[PDB]
Amino acid sequence: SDLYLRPG
Amino acid sequence: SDLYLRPG
Amino acid sequence: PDSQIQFTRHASDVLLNLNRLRSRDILTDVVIVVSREQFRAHKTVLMACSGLFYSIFTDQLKRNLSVINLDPEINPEGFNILLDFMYTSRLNLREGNIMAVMATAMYLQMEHVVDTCRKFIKAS
Amino acid sequence: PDSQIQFTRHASDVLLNLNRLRSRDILTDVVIVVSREQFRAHKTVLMACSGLFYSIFTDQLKRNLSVINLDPEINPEGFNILLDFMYTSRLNLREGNIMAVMATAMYLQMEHVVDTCRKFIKAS
Ligand SMILES: [Cl-]
Ligand SMILES: [Cl-]
Ligand SMILES: [Cl-]
Ligand SMILES: [Cl-]
Ligand code: NA
Ligand code: NA
Ligand code: NA
Ligand code: NA
Ligand code: NA
Ligand code: NA
Ligand code: NA
Ligand code: NA
Ligand code: NA
Ligand code: NA
Ligand code: NA
Ligand code: NA
Ligand code: NA
Ligand code: NA
């Protein structure tokens, strides 16, 4: 995937 | 590490 | 046969340093105007991220504009979110801004951002 | 508490697009000269990668130079290897160029490259 979620 | 080796 | 040395953090370090230049107004060469609000930037970063800006600055007549006005119906916060994305790789999509961000990304011809907006709209 | 969306390939895509601009001579704004050999580049990329270029283009008098000459004792291929590194994250170190690359990187104040050269010299 070209996206990931990470801490704000 | 800040470096890695990969194919030429 | 040769192998290659690659620096893991080089590209993100370059972007971080370019964003620091932008924050300090160093070597910025264009102001983008949306509904009387101004955003300073580096033309090359804009061209590297946006099909619209690539088209503008490859046009001989428009290449040397120092101020670019966008369609005043564009949401300037949507533009600001996309400008920050260009310089950071982080896209601040929220329920309350996703439609404005998507419309602005379509206008700026940022196809990967548009695809991402469509993904989040479809999931919700 | 908010979380963030990050695009994995954004920074490397920006660098790839900047390198394409360099190859096509689009929006390049400086020529670097080493021993009668010329290299076109974008000032902002140079400043983002090199302490020397950051110092030059933040000096009011030097900011608007369009041609910069480096010490003619510098190896121009060492410079070319470092310029390619700036725009690609890949550092073409070889037994036959490592000393020239290290000396050039020290001159350009590229501390991470210098550390990497010292690592490979020590290992061999
Ligand atoms: Cl400046
Ligand atoms: Cl995009
Ligand atoms: Cl041009
Ligand atoms: Cl470095
Ligand atoms: Na940043
Ligand atoms: Na800075
Ligand atoms: Na043209
Ligand atoms: Na034209
Ligand atoms: Na103008
Ligand atoms: Na508007
Ligand atoms: Na918002
Ligand atoms: Na490239
Ligand atoms: Na190009
Ligand atoms: Na100064
Ligand atoms: Na000065
Ligand atoms: Na000059
Ligand atoms: Na030389
Ligand atoms: Na070489």
Residue numbers in the entry:
A (entry chain B), B (entry chain B): 1734 to 1741
C (entry chain A), D (entry chain A): 5 to 128
Excerpt from the paper describing this PDB structure:
As a starting point for this work, in a parallel line of enquiry we unexpectedly observed a low-affinity interaction between the BCL6 BTB domain and a 17-residue peptide derived from the NCoR1 corepressor by 2D NMR. The low-affinity NCoR1BBD2 peptide, 1RERIAAASSDLYLRPGS17, significantly improved the crystallization of the BCL6 BTB domain, giving initial hits in 21 conditions of a sparse-matrix screen. The structure of the BCL6BTB/NCoR1BBD2 complex was solved to 1.39 Å resolution [Fig. 1(a) and Table 1]; only the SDLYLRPG sequence of the peptide was resolved. Crystallization of both the BCL6BTB/NCoR1BBD2 complex and the NCoR1BBD2-BCL6BTB chimera was favoured in conditions of high ionic strength, and the crystals had similar cell dimensions and the same packing in space group P6122. A peptide molecule thereby tethers two BTB dimers together in the lattice [Figs. 1(c) and 1(d)].
Here, we report the functionalization of the BTB (bric à-brac, tramtrack and broad complex) domain from the transcriptional repressor BCL6 to serve as a promiscuous assembly block that may assist the crystallization of a guest protein. We have shown that the surface of the BCL6 BTB domain contains versatile interaction interfaces with the potential to mediate diverse lattices in a range of crystallization conditions.
